[PDB]
Amino acid sequence: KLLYTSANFLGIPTNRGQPKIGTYQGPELIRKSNFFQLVAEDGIQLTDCGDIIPVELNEAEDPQRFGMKWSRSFSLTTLRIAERVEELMKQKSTPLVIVGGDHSMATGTILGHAEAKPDLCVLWIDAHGDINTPLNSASGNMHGMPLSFLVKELQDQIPWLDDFEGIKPCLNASNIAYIGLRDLDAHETHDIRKHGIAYFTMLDVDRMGIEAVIKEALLAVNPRLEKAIHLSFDIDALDPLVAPSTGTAVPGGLTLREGLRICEEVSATGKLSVVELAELNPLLGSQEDVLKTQSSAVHILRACLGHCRSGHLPFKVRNLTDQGIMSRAAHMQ
Amino acid sequence: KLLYTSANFLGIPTNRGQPKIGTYQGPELIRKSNFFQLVAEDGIQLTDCGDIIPVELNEAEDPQRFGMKWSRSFSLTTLRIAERVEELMKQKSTPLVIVGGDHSMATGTILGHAEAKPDLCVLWIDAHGDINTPLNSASGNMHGMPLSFLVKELQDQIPWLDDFEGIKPCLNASNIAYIGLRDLDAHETHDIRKHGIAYFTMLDVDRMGIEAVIKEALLAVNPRLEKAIHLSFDIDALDPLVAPSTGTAVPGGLTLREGLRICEEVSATGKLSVVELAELNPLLGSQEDVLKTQSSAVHILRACLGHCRSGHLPFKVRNLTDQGIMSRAAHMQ
Amino acid sequence: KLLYTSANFLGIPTNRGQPKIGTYQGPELIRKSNFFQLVAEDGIQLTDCGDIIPVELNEAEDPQRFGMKWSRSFSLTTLRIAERVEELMKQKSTPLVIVGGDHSMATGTILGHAEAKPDLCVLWIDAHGDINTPLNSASGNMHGMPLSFLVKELQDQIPWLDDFEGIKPCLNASNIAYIGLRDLDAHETHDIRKHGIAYFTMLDVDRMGIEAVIKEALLAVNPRLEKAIHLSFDIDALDPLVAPSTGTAVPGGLTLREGLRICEEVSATGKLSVVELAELNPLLGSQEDVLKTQSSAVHILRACLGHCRSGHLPFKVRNLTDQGIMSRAAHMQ
Ligand SMILES: N[C@@H](CCCC[NH3+])C(=O)O
Numbered sequence: 001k002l003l004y005t006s007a008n009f010l011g012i013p014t015n016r017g018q019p020k021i022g023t024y025q026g027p028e029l030i031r032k033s034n035f036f037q038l039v040a041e042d043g044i045q046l047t048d049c050g051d052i053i054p055v056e057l058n059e060a061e062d063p064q065r066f067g068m069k070w071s072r073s074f075s076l077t078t079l080r081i082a083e084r085v086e087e088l089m090k091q092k093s094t095p096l097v098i099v100g101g102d103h104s105m106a107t108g109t110i111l112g113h114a115e116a117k118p119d120l121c122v123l124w125i126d127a128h129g130d131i132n133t134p135l136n137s138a139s140g141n142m143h144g145m146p147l148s149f150l151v152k153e154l155q156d157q158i159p160w161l162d163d164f165e166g167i168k169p170c171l172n173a174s175n176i177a178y179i180g181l182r183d184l185d186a187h188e189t190h191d192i193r194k195h196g197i198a199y200f201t202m203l204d205v206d207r208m209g210i211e212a213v214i215k216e217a218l219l220a221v222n223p224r225l226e227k228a229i230h231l232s233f234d235i236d237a238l239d240p241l242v243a244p245s246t247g248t249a250v251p252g253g254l255t256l257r258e259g260l261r262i263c264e265e266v267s268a269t270g271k272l273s274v275v276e277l278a279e280l281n282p283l284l285g286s287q288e289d290v291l292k293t294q295s296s297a298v299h300i301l302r303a304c305l306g307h308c309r310s311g312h313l314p315f316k317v318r319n320l321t322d323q324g325i326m327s328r329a330a331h332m333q
Numbered sequence: 334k335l336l337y338t339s340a341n342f343l344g345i346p347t348n349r350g351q352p353k354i355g356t357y358q359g360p361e362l363i364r365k366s367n368f369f370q371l372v373a374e375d376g377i378q379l380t381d382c383g384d385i386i387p388v389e390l391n392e393a394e395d396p397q398r399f400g401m402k403w404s405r406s407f408s409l410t411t412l413r414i415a416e417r418v419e420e421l422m423k424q425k426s427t428p429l430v431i432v433g434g435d436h437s438m439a440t441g442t443i444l445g446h447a448e449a450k451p452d453l454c455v456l457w458i459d460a461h462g463d464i465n466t467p468l469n470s471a472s473g474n475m476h477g478m479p480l481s482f483l484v485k486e487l488q489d490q491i492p493w494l495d496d497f498e499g500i501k502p503c504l505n506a507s508n509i510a511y512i513g514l515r516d517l518d519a520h521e522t523h524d525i526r527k528h529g530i531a532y533f534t535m536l537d538v539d540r541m542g543i544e545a546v547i548k549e550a551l552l553a554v555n556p557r558l559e560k561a562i563h564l565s566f567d568i569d570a571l572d573p574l575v576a577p578s579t580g581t582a583v584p585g586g587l588t589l590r591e592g593l594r595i596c597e598e599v600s601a602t603g604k605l606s607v608v609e610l611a612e613l614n615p616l617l618g619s620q621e622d623v624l625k626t627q628s629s630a631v632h633i634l635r636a637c638l639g640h641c642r643s644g645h646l647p648f649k650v651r652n653l654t655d656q657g658i659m660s661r662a663a664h665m666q
Numbered sequence: 667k668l669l670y671t672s673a674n675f676l677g678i679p680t681n682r683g684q685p686k687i688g689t690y691q692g693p694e695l696i697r698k699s700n701f702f703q704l705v706a707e708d709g710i711q712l713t714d715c716g717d718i719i720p721v722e723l724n725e726a727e728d729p730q731r732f733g734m735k736w737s738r739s740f741s742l743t744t745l746r747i748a749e750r751v752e753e754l755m756k757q758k759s760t761p762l763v764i765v766g767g768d769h770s771m772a773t774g775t776i777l778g779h780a781e782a783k784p785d786l787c788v789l790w791i792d793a794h795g796d797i798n799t800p801l802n803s804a805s806g807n808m809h810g811m812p813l814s815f816l817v818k819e820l821q822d823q824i825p826w827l828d829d830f831e832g833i834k835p836c837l838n839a840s841n842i843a844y845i846g847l848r849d850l851d852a853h854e855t856h857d858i859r860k861h862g863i864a865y866f867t868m869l870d871v872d873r874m875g876i877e878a879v880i881k882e883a884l885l886a887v888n889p890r891l892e893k894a895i896h897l898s899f900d901i902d903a904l905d906p907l908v909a910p911s912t913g914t915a916v917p918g919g920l921t922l923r924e925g926l927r928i929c930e931e932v933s934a935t936g937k938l939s940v941v942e943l944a945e946l947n948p949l950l951g952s953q954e955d956v957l958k959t960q961s962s963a964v965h966i967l968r969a970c971l972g973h974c975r976s977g978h979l980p981f982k983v984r985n986l987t988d989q990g991i992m993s994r995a996a997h998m999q
Pocket residue numbers: 103128129130132137138139140141143144145183184185248279
C-alpha cells in the first residue's frame with residue numbers, strides 16, 4: 001500500500017549562492033514544522049541524516065573570479081555535498097529528501113546523485129533557468145548557475161579554474177526538463193533552445209494545463225519510467241502569494257495545487273530518488289509570510305513522499321464492539 | 334425570470350462544536366454586510382427569521398463522554414435546531430439560508446430538513462469529511478462529527494447515549510456527495526470508501542475541473558433533479574487566501590470562482606432547499622482577513638439565491654424621452 | 667524578431683472621474699518602476715511623450731448636471747485628450763502605451779484614436795461595464811460612463827449638453843468586446859444585450875477557459891485581424907489578491923496569468939495600436955499592496971509590447987573563446 005516505506009532527510013544550509021542572509025535557516029524551518037509528525041502518520045519511516053556543513057570561506061580567501069562571487073566556497077562546498085549524497089545514495093527504494101539552502105547546492109547534490117546513479121534524469125521546477133554560464137551572469141550569484149557546471153554540452157562556455165576540476169559534468173541536455181519558467185535571461189534561452197533542453201514555461205502551463213505539462217516533461221526525459229528521478233524544486237516556482245519568503249519572487253507562478261500535482265505524479269512513478277527543496281528564506285517577509293511559505297513547503301514535501309489528498313486507509317481498522325461498547329445500532333434491540 | 338422570488342434567513346451561532354471562540358459571531362458578520370441590500374436589489378424578498386439560541390451547558394453539566402467535548406450541549410442543541418428548521422421548512426419554492434456557527438449545527442439542520450423532506454440529498458462542500466465517529470476522533474470536537482450521527486450505515490460505530498435517542502439517522506450514504514476534500518482522517522477515508530459515499534477531493538478538482546466535478550456530484554445523488562438539495566458549505570472549503578478567518582484552514586482549497594460555480598449550478602437546479610454556511614469566525618485573523626472572509630461569504634450566499642455574474646435585467650427599463658429630457662440624438666435634428 | 671520595435675508612453679493623471687484621491691499618481695507609479703529598463707532590455711525603443719494635463723475645474727465652475735459629477739471637467743478633458751492622442755497616432759507599427767488615471771480618460775483616448783483610425787475595435791478588460799448612461803448612474807461618477815458617450819446606438823439615452831457637442835460617438839456596438847465582467851449594473855446588462863455587444867464575463871472565463879474567451883472576443887470584433895486594436899485594461903479586471911490598490915475592487919477576478927494571456931494574444935495579432943491601463947491608485951492599501959499592484963501592472967504592460975514568458979534570444983551571442991579565455995572543454999586537451 002506504500003510506494004516508499006522509508007526515506008532519508010538531509011539539511012543543506014547553503015547561503016553563499018546569493019546575497020540575502022537567511023537561506024541557511026531553511027532546514028530548521030522544516031524541522032520545526034510538523035513535517036516529521038505528518039510523514040510518520042502516513043506510515044513512512046523518516047530518518048534524519050543531519051545537516052551538511054557548507055564551506056564558507058572568509059572574504060579574503062574567496063575573491064571574485066570571472067565575476068563569480070564566492071566561487072571557491074562553491075567548489076569546495078559542491079565536492080563536500082557530492083560525497084555525502086553519494087554515500088547516502090549507495091547506502092522498493094529509499095528517497096532522499098533534501099532541504100536547502102539556496103539553489104547553488106544542486107551542483108553538488110546532482111553530482112553526488114549521478115555518482116550513484118549515472119543514468120538519472122532531472123526535473124527542474126523553477127521560475128528561473130539557473131543555467132547562466134559565468135561570463136553571462138549579470139549578478140555573479142552562484143545560485144543562478146548550478147546547472148551550467150553539470151551539463152556536458154555547455155563545457156566550452158565554462159572558464160577553466162583548477163579548483164573546479166573535480167566538478168565533472170554528469171548530465172546530458174537530453175536528461176533535464178524544466179517546469180514553471182517565467183524569468184529566463186536571454187543567454188539561458190539561447191542555450192536551452194540550442195541544445196534542445198525540454199522546457200515548459202508558465203505560458204505552456206497556461207495553454208496546455210499542468211496535467212499535460214507533467215506528462216510531456218516525464219515523456220521527454222523518462223519515457224518508460226526506466227530512470228531514477230532527481231526532482232529539484234525551487235520554492236520560488238510557486239506563486240509569491242503562497243511562497244512569499246524567498247529571495248527572487250516572480251509573480252504569476254504555479255499555484256500550490258499545480259505544485260502538488262507535479263510532486264504527486266513524480267512520486268507515483270516509483271522512481272523518485274532525490275527531491276530537494278531550495279530557496280526557503282525565513283528571514284524574508286512577515287511572520288505570516290514565513291508561515292505561508294513553511295506550510296507550502298511542508299505540503300509539497302509530503303506529496304513527494306506519497307501523501308494522497310484523496311485520503312489514506314488506517315493501518316488497523318477500529319471497531320466499536322471490539323472495545324466492548326454498546327453501539328446505537330446494538331442498543332436498538 | 335426568477336427561480337426563487339423569496340427566501341428565509343436564519344442565524345445559528347454555535348460555538349461548542351470547536352474550541353476557538355468567535356464562530357458565534359458568524360450570523361452578525363453577514364447581517365452587518367450588504368448581503369440583504371444586494372439580495373433585495375436582485376428582486377428577491379428575504380425574510381430574517383432571527384437566530385436559534387444554542388444550548389450551552391456549564392462545564393460541570395457537560396463532562397466528556399467517550400472523548401466527546403460538550404456532547405450534551407450538542408444533543409440538546411441539535412434537537413432544538415431540528416424543530417425550528419422543520420417548522421420553517423413545513424411553513425417555485427422558498428430556500429432557507431442558514432449562517433453558522435461551527436459545523437456541528439449540521440446534525441440539527443439536516444435532521445430538521447429531512448423531517449420535512451425525507452428524500453433530500455446532501456452536497457457537502459468542505460476541506461474535511463466531518464464524519465469522524467466518536468471513538469475515532471483525535472480531538473473530540475463535535476464540528477468534526479456531525480455527519481456520523483446522520484448516516485444510517487454508520488450506526489454500529491456510534492456509542493449509545495440516552496440523550497442521543499431523539500437524533501435518528503436520516504441519511505443513506507447514497508444521498509451524500511462531498512466536494513473540496515483535502516484533509517481526511519484515515520478512518521473517515523475508510524468509512525467513505527466502505528459505504529460508497531460519492532466524494533470529489535481537490536485532486537479530482539485538479540484533474541477533472543470543477544465543471545465536471547459539479548456535474549458528477551449532482552448525477553451521483555440527484556440524477557434527475559427529483560430531490561430537494563441540502564447544501565452544506567464550510568467556508569474552509571475555500572482557499573485560505575480568500576477565506577482566512579476560519580478555525581481549521583487548509584492550503585490548496587477552492588478558488589472563490591470554483592466556489593461560485595458550485596453554488597451557481599446548485600441554485601439553477603431549482604432544487605436548492607437549504608443552504609448553510611459554516612465556520613465563519615470573525616475573531617480570527619486581521620481586520621483585512623475578516624473583510625476578505627465576509628466578502629467571500631456574501632458572494633457565495635448571493636450565488637446560492639440565484640445572483641448571476643453575467644448580469645441581471647432591470648425590472649423597469651428607464652427611458653430618457655419619458656422623463657421629458659432631450660437626448661443628443663433628438664437634439665441632432 | 668520583434669513585432670514592435672518602438673513604442674510611445676503617455677501619462678494621463680485623471681482623478682475627476684471618481685471620488686478617491688490618488689489615481690493621478692498612476693503614471694508616476696509606472697515611471698518609478700523598472701518598466702522602461704525592462705522594455706529596453708527586450709530591445710524595444712520606448713519614447714516618453716510626457717503627461718496630458720487634465721482640466722480640473724473648481725467646484726463652483728462644475729456643478730452637477732443630470733446627476734453627473736464634474737461633467738464639465740470631463741468634456742473639456744476628453745477633448746484635450748483626444749487632440750493629443752490623435753496627434754500621436756497620426757505621427758510594422760508604433761503602439762501607444764497609456765497609463766491612467768481613472769477610466770473616464772477612455773472617452774478621450776478612443777475618440778482621439780478613432781480620429782486617426784476610424785475602423786478600430788475595442789477590447790475592454792474590466793470587472794465593470796463602464797457604460798452607464800447619465801440618467802441611470804447611481805453614483806454620477808464619470809469613470810462608470812466613458813463608453814456610453816462613444817457608442818452610436820446609445821445616443822438617444824445621452825442627455826444633450828452643449829459642451830458635449832464635440833464628443834461625437836465613434837463606435838458601433840459591433841466594434842466592442844468585454845472580458846472579465848462580474849459587476850454589471852442592471853441597465854448596463856440591458857443595453858449590452860439589446861445592442862448585441864460581445865461580452866465575456868467571469869462566468870464565461872470559468873466555463874470556457876481564457877484561451878477560448880480571448881479567441882472568441884477577437885473573432886467577434888476583429889475576425890481577420892484587419893482592424894487596429896484599442897485595448898482598454900482596467901487594473902480592477904484582475905483579482906484584488908494581485909491588484910489590491912484600485913478604487914472598486916471586485917473579488918473573483920482574472921488571475922495575473924489570465925491577464926497576461928489576454929495581453930500576449932492581443933500583442934501577437936500585430937494590430938495592437940493603443941493600450942491603456944486605468945485605475946491604478948497608489949494611495950489605496952498598504953505599501954505591500956501598492957508594490958503588488960505596481961508589479962501586476964508592469965508585467966501586464968510588458969506583455970502588451972511583446973514580452974515572452976518563454977524567453978528572448980540575445981541580440982549578440984556571447985562566446986568564451988572570443989574573449990580569449992580557456993574553457994573547461996579546451997583545457998581538457
Ligand atoms: N537568472 C538570475 C536569477 C537567478 C535566481 C536564482 N533563484 C541569475 O542568474 O542570477
